[PDB]
Swiss-Prot record:
Coiled coil: none annotated. It is found in: Nucleus, Nucleolus. Belongs to the RRP1 family. GO terms for cellular component: nucleolus; nucleus; preribosome, large subunit precursor; preribosome, small subunit precursor. It comes from the Eukaryota. Present with 6960 molecules/cell in log phase SD medium. GO terms for biological process: rRNA processing. Required for 27S rRNA processing to 25S and 5.8S. The keyword Isomerase does not apply. It comes from Saccharomyces cerevisiae (strain ATCC 204508 / S288c). This is Ribosomal RNA-processing protein 1.
Amino acid sequence: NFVKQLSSNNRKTRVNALEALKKYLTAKQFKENKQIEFNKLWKGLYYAMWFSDRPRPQQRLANELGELHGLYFDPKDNSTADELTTNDKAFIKFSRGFWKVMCFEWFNIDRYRLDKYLLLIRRVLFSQLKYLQSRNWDKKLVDEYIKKVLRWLPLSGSPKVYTGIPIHIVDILLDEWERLLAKKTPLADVIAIFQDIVADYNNSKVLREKIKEDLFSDTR
RNA sequence: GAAAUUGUUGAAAGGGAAGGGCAUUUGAUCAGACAUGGUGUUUUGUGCCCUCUGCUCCUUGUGGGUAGGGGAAUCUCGCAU
């Protein structure tokens, strides 16, 4: 498998396992189904960052773990009012599991490696984000993708998600929004989600007041 | 080879009590640095220094160890005078 090669204790078989995962992601004929296989892939990539300690190789590794949303379903096919055709259909299963992995992991990360996963989740939100598609508009990708962002990670009507990751997404999605390079994009519907969180009672004050200051106070 | 206790020697005290506490003098006596620089300039001379050529352990850059020559006319980078 790849969960034993990405979670190895050897550096060389983890780099070679990443390159065989590059060939495995450009071998698109086998990644057709089975959500939990993608969940296991993101758990192996989670450990594959977890063994990297030095700052320059962990930034190279975060950049290429973001780039794995780019090799897997590159934009070139560039579908026309084509709903979800083998570059956008399976991609969403590669996104959700990542957030699911972080939804499983936010207790179990210590005070010295948590910067790696703040920076990692910065790069990965920027990269899915960059692959809405090559352009920032694909409409059923926007509402289906925003349903498979809304329905898991900024739920904020469920306490099952850990409250540090939506406030970190609030801290990063503006600068990493405008890393895409004043234009008009489906941003506001995204912001409507946060307005839903301000509309949602039966929550804690932090989500309610920290997005209500941090996200809405931005003049951009 | 402890104390009680005994002798000798030395010191001290003693007009019908000593030993104790607070404080001090006198007499006797013991402590009391193989401490020695620090800083800023200037001769030189070396090296892990500059430069030429390398070799080797491993993990991510912000690596480590270790040879052969040359060169101070630049360099305090360090250490010696």
